[PDB]
Amino acid sequence: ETSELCGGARICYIFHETFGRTLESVDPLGGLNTIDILTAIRNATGPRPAL
Amino acid sequence: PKLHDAIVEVVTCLLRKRLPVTNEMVHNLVAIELAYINTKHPDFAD
C-alpha cells in the first residue's frame, strides 16, 4: 500500500537521512577552545619540564 | 699499654658506626640525581 515510508527503506532513511546526517552535525571542532587546550597540554606535561 | 690499645679500638668503633651512615647518604645522593631530570637547568640548553 502506497503510504508513509515504513518497514524497509524507512530504516534505510534512519541509517542515512537521520543517522548519517546526525553524525555530520557533530563537532568536528566542537569543544576545541584553543586556550583550554593549551591548559590541557600543560596538564599533559604534568610535574616535569618538556622539550 | 692496655689503655692505649683500648683507645684505638674505641676510635675505630666510632668510625665504623659513622661509616654506613655516610654510605646511606651517598647512595641517597645518587638516587636524588636519578629521581628527577631538570631540563630547565640553567646550564642545560640546546
Short mmCIF file of N, CA and C in Angstrom, two decimals:
data_model
loop_
_atom_site.label_atom_id
_atom_site.label_comp_id
_atom_site.label_asym_id
_atom_site.label_seq_id
_atom_site.Cartn_x
_atom_site.Cartn_y
_atom_site.Cartn_z
N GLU A 1 0.83 -1.19 0.00
CA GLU A 1 0.00 0.00 0.00
C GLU A 1 0.86 1.24 0.00
N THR A 2 0.63 2.12 -0.97
CA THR A 2 1.39 3.35 -1.06
C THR A 2 1.01 4.29 0.07
N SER A 3 1.99 4.63 0.90
CA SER A 3 1.74 5.43 2.08
C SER A 3 3.03 6.03 2.62
N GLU A 4 3.02 6.37 3.91
CA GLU A 4 4.22 6.83 4.59
C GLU A 4 5.32 5.79 4.52
N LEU A 5 6.55 6.25 4.33
CA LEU A 5 7.69 5.36 4.26
C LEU A 5 7.81 4.55 5.54
N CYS A 6 7.83 3.23 5.40
CA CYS A 6 7.89 2.36 6.57
C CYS A 6 8.44 0.98 6.23
N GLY A 7 8.74 0.20 7.27
CA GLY A 7 9.07 -1.21 7.12
C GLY A 7 10.52 -1.44 6.71
N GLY A 8 10.83 -1.11 5.47
CA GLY A 8 12.14 -1.39 4.90
C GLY A 8 12.98 -0.13 4.75
N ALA A 9 12.74 0.59 3.65
CA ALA A 9 13.55 1.75 3.28
C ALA A 9 13.45 2.89 4.30
N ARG A 10 12.47 2.82 5.19
CA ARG A 10 12.40 3.74 6.31
C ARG A 10 13.58 3.56 7.24
N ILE A 11 14.06 2.34 7.37
CA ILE A 11 15.25 2.08 8.15
C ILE A 11 16.48 2.54 7.39
N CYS A 12 16.47 2.38 6.07
CA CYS A 12 17.50 2.97 5.22
C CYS A 12 17.57 4.47 5.44
N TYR A 13 16.39 5.10 5.50
CA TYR A 13 16.28 6.51 5.82
C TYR A 13 16.91 6.80 7.18
N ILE A 14 16.56 5.99 8.18
CA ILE A 14 17.14 6.13 9.51
C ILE A 14 18.66 6.06 9.49
N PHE A 15 19.21 5.19 8.65
CA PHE A 15 20.65 4.99 8.62
C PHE A 15 21.39 5.96 7.71
N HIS A 16 20.68 6.94 7.18
CA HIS A 16 21.30 7.89 6.27
C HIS A 16 20.80 9.28 6.53
N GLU A 17 19.52 9.49 6.24
CA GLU A 17 18.93 10.81 6.36
C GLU A 17 18.84 11.24 7.81
N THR A 18 18.62 10.28 8.70
CA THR A 18 18.64 10.59 10.11
C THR A 18 20.04 10.45 10.69
N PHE A 19 20.51 9.21 10.77
CA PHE A 19 21.75 8.88 11.46
C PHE A 19 22.97 9.52 10.83
N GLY A 20 23.13 9.33 9.52
CA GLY A 20 24.29 9.85 8.82
C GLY A 20 24.38 11.36 8.97
N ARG A 21 23.26 12.04 8.76
CA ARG A 21 23.22 13.49 8.92
C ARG A 21 23.48 13.90 10.36
N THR A 22 22.88 13.18 11.30
CA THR A 22 23.08 13.47 12.71
C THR A 22 24.55 13.51 13.04
N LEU A 23 25.29 12.50 12.58
CA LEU A 23 26.71 12.46 12.83
C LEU A 23 27.43 13.59 12.13
N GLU A 24 27.00 13.94 10.92
CA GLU A 24 27.62 15.03 10.19
C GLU A 24 27.53 16.36 10.95
N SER A 25 26.50 16.51 11.78
CA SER A 25 26.36 17.73 12.58
C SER A 25 27.27 17.76 13.81
N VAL A 26 27.89 16.63 14.15
CA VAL A 26 28.66 16.55 15.39
C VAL A 26 30.07 17.11 15.23
N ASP A 27 30.42 18.03 16.12
CA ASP A 27 31.74 18.66 16.15
C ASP A 27 32.11 19.19 14.72
N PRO A 28 33.22 18.75 14.06
CA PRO A 28 34.48 18.09 14.45
C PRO A 28 35.41 19.00 15.25
N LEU A 29 35.08 20.28 15.33
CA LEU A 29 35.87 21.22 16.10
C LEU A 29 35.17 21.61 17.40
N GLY A 30 34.09 20.92 17.72
CA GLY A 30 33.32 21.23 18.92
C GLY A 30 34.13 20.98 20.18
N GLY A 31 34.09 21.94 21.10
CA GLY A 31 34.77 21.82 22.38
C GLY A 31 36.21 22.31 22.33
N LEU A 32 36.73 22.58 21.13
CA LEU A 32 38.14 22.90 20.99
C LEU A 32 38.42 24.38 21.24
N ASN A 33 38.42 24.77 22.50
CA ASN A 33 38.87 26.08 22.90
C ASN A 33 40.38 26.10 22.99
N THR A 34 41.01 26.86 22.10
CA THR A 34 42.46 26.92 22.00
C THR A 34 43.13 27.08 23.36
N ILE A 35 42.57 27.95 24.19
CA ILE A 35 43.20 28.29 25.46
C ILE A 35 43.05 27.15 26.45
N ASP A 36 41.89 26.51 26.44
CA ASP A 36 41.65 25.36 27.29
C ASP A 36 42.54 24.20 26.89
N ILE A 37 42.79 24.08 25.59
CA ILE A 37 43.70 23.07 25.07
C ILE A 37 45.12 23.32 25.52
N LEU A 38 45.53 24.58 25.49
CA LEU A 38 46.85 24.95 25.98
C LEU A 38 47.01 24.57 27.45
N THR A 39 45.95 24.76 28.22
CA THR A 39 45.93 24.29 29.60
C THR A 39 46.03 22.78 29.67
N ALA A 40 45.27 22.11 28.81
CA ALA A 40 45.23 20.66 28.79
C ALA A 40 46.60 20.06 28.48
N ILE A 41 47.33 20.65 27.54
CA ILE A 41 48.64 20.13 27.18
C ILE A 41 49.69 20.46 28.23
N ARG A 42 49.47 21.54 28.98
CA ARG A 42 50.28 21.81 30.15
C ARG A 42 50.04 20.76 31.22
N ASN A 43 48.78 20.36 31.37
CA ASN A 43 48.43 19.28 32.28
C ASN A 43 49.00 17.96 31.79
N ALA A 44 48.98 17.76 30.47
CA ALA A 44 49.52 16.54 29.87
C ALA A 44 51.00 16.40 30.16
N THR A 45 51.72 17.51 30.16
CA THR A 45 53.11 17.51 30.56
C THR A 45 53.25 17.09 32.01
N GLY A 46 52.46 17.71 32.88
CA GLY A 46 52.48 17.36 34.28
C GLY A 46 53.68 17.99 34.98
N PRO A 47 54.05 17.44 36.13
CA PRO A 47 55.06 17.95 37.06
C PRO A 47 56.45 18.17 36.43
N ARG A 48 56.73 17.46 35.34
CA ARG A 48 58.02 17.58 34.67
C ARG A 48 58.09 18.83 33.80
N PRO A 49 59.28 19.14 33.30
CA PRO A 49 59.56 20.06 32.21
C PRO A 49 59.46 19.32 30.88
N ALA A 50 59.31 20.08 29.80
CA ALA A 50 59.12 19.47 28.49
C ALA A 50 59.94 20.17 27.41
N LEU A 51 60.35 19.39 26.42
CA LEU A 51 61.06 19.92 25.26
C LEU A 51 60.09 20.20 24.13
N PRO B 1 99.76 0.49 78.37
CA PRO B 1 99.57 -0.22 77.08
C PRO B 1 98.14 -0.71 76.85
N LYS B 2 97.55 -1.33 77.87
CA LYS B 2 96.19 -1.85 77.77
C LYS B 2 95.21 -0.74 77.42
N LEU B 3 95.27 0.35 78.18
CA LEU B 3 94.52 1.55 77.84
C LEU B 3 94.78 2.00 76.43
N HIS B 4 96.05 2.07 76.05
CA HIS B 4 96.43 2.57 74.74
C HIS B 4 95.65 1.88 73.64
N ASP B 5 95.65 0.56 73.68
CA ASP B 5 95.00 -0.22 72.65
C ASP B 5 93.49 -0.11 72.73
N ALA B 6 92.97 -0.02 73.95
CA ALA B 6 91.54 0.16 74.16
C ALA B 6 91.05 1.44 73.51
N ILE B 7 91.86 2.50 73.63
CA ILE B 7 91.54 3.77 72.99
C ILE B 7 91.39 3.59 71.50
N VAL B 8 92.37 2.93 70.90
CA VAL B 8 92.36 2.70 69.47
C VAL B 8 91.12 1.95 69.03
N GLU B 9 90.77 0.91 69.77
CA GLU B 9 89.60 0.11 69.45
C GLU B 9 88.35 0.97 69.43
N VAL B 10 88.18 1.79 70.46
CA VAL B 10 87.02 2.66 70.57
C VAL B 10 86.93 3.62 69.41
N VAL B 11 88.07 4.18 69.01
CA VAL B 11 88.09 5.12 67.90
C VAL B 11 87.55 4.48 66.64
N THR B 12 88.04 3.27 66.33
CA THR B 12 87.65 2.62 65.09
C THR B 12 86.21 2.14 65.16
N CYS B 13 85.73 1.85 66.37
CA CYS B 13 84.33 1.54 66.55
C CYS B 13 83.48 2.70 66.11
N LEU B 14 83.83 3.89 66.60
CA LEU B 14 83.12 5.10 66.23
C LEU B 14 83.16 5.34 64.73
N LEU B 15 84.31 5.12 64.12
CA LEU B 15 84.44 5.29 62.69
C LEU B 15 83.50 4.35 61.94
N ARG B 16 83.43 3.11 62.40
CA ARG B 16 82.56 2.12 61.78
C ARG B 16 81.10 2.44 62.02
N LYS B 17 80.79 3.06 63.15
CA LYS B 17 79.42 3.49 63.44
C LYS B 17 78.95 4.54 62.45
N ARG B 18 79.85 5.44 62.07
CA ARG B 18 79.50 6.54 61.18
C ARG B 18 79.71 6.21 59.72
N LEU B 19 80.40 5.10 59.45
CA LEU B 19 80.64 4.67 58.08
C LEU B 19 79.34 4.48 57.26
N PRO B 20 78.52 3.46 57.58
CA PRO B 20 77.30 3.15 56.86
C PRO B 20 76.36 4.35 56.75
N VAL B 21 76.42 5.25 57.73
CA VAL B 21 75.59 6.44 57.71
C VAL B 21 75.92 7.29 56.51
N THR B 22 77.21 7.53 56.30
CA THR B 22 77.67 8.26 55.14
C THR B 22 77.35 7.50 53.87
N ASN B 23 77.52 6.18 53.91
CA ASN B 23 77.21 5.35 52.76
C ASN B 23 75.77 5.52 52.33
N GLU B 24 74.86 5.55 53.31
CA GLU B 24 73.46 5.74 53.02
C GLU B 24 73.22 7.08 52.38
N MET B 25 73.89 8.11 52.90
CA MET B 25 73.76 9.44 52.34
C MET B 25 74.20 9.48 50.90
N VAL B 26 75.39 8.95 50.63
CA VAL B 26 75.93 8.96 49.28
C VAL B 26 75.06 8.20 48.32
N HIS B 27 74.59 7.04 48.75
CA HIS B 27 73.62 6.28 47.99
C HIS B 27 72.41 7.14 47.66
N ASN B 28 71.90 7.82 48.67
CA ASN B 28 70.76 8.69 48.50
C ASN B 28 71.06 9.80 47.54
N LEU B 29 72.25 10.38 47.63
CA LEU B 29 72.63 11.49 46.77
C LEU B 29 72.56 11.10 45.31
N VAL B 30 73.03 9.90 45.00
CA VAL B 30 72.92 9.38 43.65
C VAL B 30 71.48 9.18 43.26
N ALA B 31 70.70 8.60 44.18
CA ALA B 31 69.29 8.36 43.95
C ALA B 31 68.55 9.66 43.65
N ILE B 32 68.96 10.72 44.33
CA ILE B 32 68.39 12.04 44.10
C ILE B 32 68.63 12.52 42.68
N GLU B 33 69.82 12.26 42.16
CA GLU B 33 70.12 12.60 40.78
C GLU B 33 69.31 11.75 39.82
N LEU B 34 69.06 10.51 40.21
CA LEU B 34 68.22 9.61 39.43
C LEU B 34 66.74 9.97 39.55
N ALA B 35 66.37 10.58 40.66
CA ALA B 35 64.97 10.86 40.97
C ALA B 35 64.32 11.79 39.94
N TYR B 36 65.07 12.75 39.43
CA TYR B 36 64.49 13.76 38.57
C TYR B 36 65.50 14.45 37.68
N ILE B 37 65.13 14.64 36.42
CA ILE B 37 65.95 15.37 35.47
C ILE B 37 65.37 16.74 35.17
N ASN B 38 66.17 17.77 35.43
CA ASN B 38 65.74 19.13 35.20
C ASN B 38 66.22 19.63 33.85
N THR B 39 65.36 19.54 32.85
CA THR B 39 65.71 20.03 31.52
C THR B 39 65.66 21.56 31.45
N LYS B 40 65.17 22.19 32.52
CA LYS B 40 65.19 23.64 32.63
C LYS B 40 66.43 24.12 33.36
N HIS B 41 67.35 23.20 33.66
CA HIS B 41 68.59 23.56 34.32
C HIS B 41 69.29 24.69 33.58
N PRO B 42 69.87 25.63 34.32
CA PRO B 42 70.42 26.87 33.79
C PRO B 42 71.60 26.63 32.85
N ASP B 43 72.29 25.51 33.03
CA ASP B 43 73.43 25.19 32.19
C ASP B 43 73.06 24.20 31.10
N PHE B 44 71.77 23.90 30.98
CA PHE B 44 71.32 22.90 30.04
C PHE B 44 70.41 23.51 28.99
N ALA B 45 70.91 23.60 27.77
CA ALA B 45 70.15 24.18 26.67
C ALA B 45 70.62 23.62 25.35
N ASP B 46 69.73 23.61 24.36
CA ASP B 46 70.06 23.04 23.06
C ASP B 46 69.11 23.55 21.99
#
